[model samples]
Target: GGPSVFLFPPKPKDTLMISRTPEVTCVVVDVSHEDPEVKFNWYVDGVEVHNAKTKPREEQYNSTYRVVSVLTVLHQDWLNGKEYKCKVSNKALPASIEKTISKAKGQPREPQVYTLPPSREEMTKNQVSLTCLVKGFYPSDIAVEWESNGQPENNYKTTPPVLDSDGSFFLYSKLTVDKSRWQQGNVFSCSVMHEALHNHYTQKSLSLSP
Candidate 1:
């Protein structure tokens, strides 16, 4: 309603929910696909939002249009409301794009499952370390679990996911087991949960190898 606001992209704004420190921040992008030119002011809870560096970029999918702007909401001022949008011109806009969460925005790809068996000494000591690598996912957040036979078990170590330049996410999780579970010929699996995935949770199971 103010700064010559235009449309964004036809779809796929799943990768832009940038996390702002100080507990509140949102990134705004559009369709119609305008990436050049300039951005406008934003609004939150009907109040003017500022300091968001607006950057315009180009896009091409179902249509060709200039995305009006990409803005970040910060300064401990953009939180505490339900509207959470962004705008230009003269209104309070939402800080998010299409109101989608990072997971919803992130589509899915089955993760790559790899097994890492603990060393000889570690195993001899009645402890073993097993790992699962979940890769090629969209939007970042993923749920991984260590399953024994068919039940979820505790005692696993998960590392923070890594982001790729091409918009994919990679995760690493390790499971530690002892002699008893190891010798049971137990079937171990790494179950992955992602928003893009449909149906039952994705699983990649492996057995302990001596």
Candidate 2:
């Protein structure tokens, strides 16, 4: 019997912005035929990308093979709104199948900022850790900073942006300060800047208890 070819077209999902890299994913499954030498090519705005990696997993279900190809591009290209395409070809199917996806167009979502003061345990250690929780942001690129009494505070670290189940992103920033400063009634603030807010910023503050 001749080899049968059943190719599932690639479907592009949402673009994932992880750290500084924005990745686009496409999945294709061949339920009838399996070929180890299958070729999958990626393109960005009609330009071929040589660095795209394809991960092939041989599935045991139905005694067939499947492959999932994921493509990642630079964060700047994503912000510029470029198109992406995945092309696949195999011996069973001499002609290639292609699918394309572009950036989702709409209003970018603003982030909700919240600040938390140091806990009892942190205060006891002579070091205070203030937290800033930024939630429900879209388009991923954001800036977060800590301030004490309207001045910048450099003793802080920010976590990488995490994608939420609701298609939004969230992140955390912790500001370390001396316990004496909290006892002195100094106010600490967290400022969040995103493209959605334009020139304005979202700020949240916390002060020690009297």
Candidate 3:
């Protein structure tokens, strides 16, 4: 008997696939293979990005694709409204495959700012102590200075502030002056500076009696 005749046309081979997210402008290339080991090459704007070792499928990002037993590729920094391209190849394959994807706008959250403490004032005989407190800051980047009689005072001493678990900071500074000088209504002021924030200063005067 003659060989059976087949009437239908052969099924078309499935080529590599590409995809990406709207927020990120990246391209993912999916390469399929029967072998256990598959390799992939990545490119962006026609420039070769790189090839990475196989990673867990769960760790893949929005611009990543998988091709059966083959390899996967991911592109980062793909901003929205931008276009990206990727290519995948394997040792068994003769030529590499290419794919492109476009991204959309993404909304990023803003940073948080912590509330600060209130300014404090105090006066003592021949001396004055001012305590300034701050909150919601780390590493305590503060600046403290004392001024008297419209001139900067070099006789003042400061105590380093301490940081707390609640993101609050506490510091105290003392300015000692001659009783006669203080009685003359010397202007004593304390100031604190914050990183990327406005400075805080407070002034107070003391009077002595016979």
Candidate 4:
């Protein structure tokens, strides 16, 4: 057959071990189909990989070239939930075949929260400030809400998540209310949403005093 032998679609493998030892791979019909003259693209989490390199060489039987590329990662990267993949584009094939990173689920972080009203000195003539402090979670992501007298409150502020020294996180939310709303019998609350709770979230509420 003519060099058109490379015209047939190359065989592409699916799913690789992204943990411990993993290989980002691609294969072609023959030597003429190797990279440089052809293109091999890799990605991390569906995003294109930067500084990618393809290793090209002859097959075991001294046959045509089998082009493969590699990148190394620690077991922790996968254990911490990262993804990777590769795609091939060649003149011989109108469309490319892709190899994707393996998928797995990891433990979810369930954050704990507490509510504390700001000091009387921090209180203002027209507003009351309440704080929701969240801690003891991994993944650094969380959702928070505030309620006063059992109704949702919109005047609230939140802090960006901060990483703790121990690989956990710290996040805070604040609620601002009209000074009149901080009556002795009113109840204030902070609700938290996180993966750890699955379909439900956790919360804490405080009753104010004169």
TM-score against truth, every candidate:
0.47, 0.50, 0.33, 0.50
Q: Give the Å error, residue 33, model 3.
A: 54
Model 1 residue runs over 4 Å out of place are 1-110
Model 3: per-residue Cα lDDT at residue 174: 61
Superior by lDDT: candidate 1 or candidate 3: 1
Off by over 4 Å in 4: 1-107, 198-200
Candidate 1: clashing residue pairs, number: 26
Clashing pairs in 4: none
lDDT of all predictions, in order shown? 0.53, 0.71, 0.39, 0.61
> Mind giving the per-residue lDDT tens digits that candidate 2 earns over 33-145?
54545667888889898776667666657666666666666655665577788777766665667887765555578888888877766657888789999999886767888
Candidate achieving higher TM-score, 1 or 3: 1
List ranges where model 2 is wrong by over 4 Å: 1-107, 198-200
Worst lDDT run of 10 residues, candidate 3, spans 8-17
Q: lDDT winner among the candidates?
A: 2
* Number of residue pairs clashing in candidate 4, backbone atoms closer than 3 angstroms, sequence gap of 3 or more or interchain: 0
- Which has the higher lDDT value, candidate number 2 or candidate number 4? 2
What does candidate 2 score on TM?
A: 0.50
Give lDDT for model 2. 0.71
| For model 2, the run of ten residues with the poorest summed lDDT | 7-16
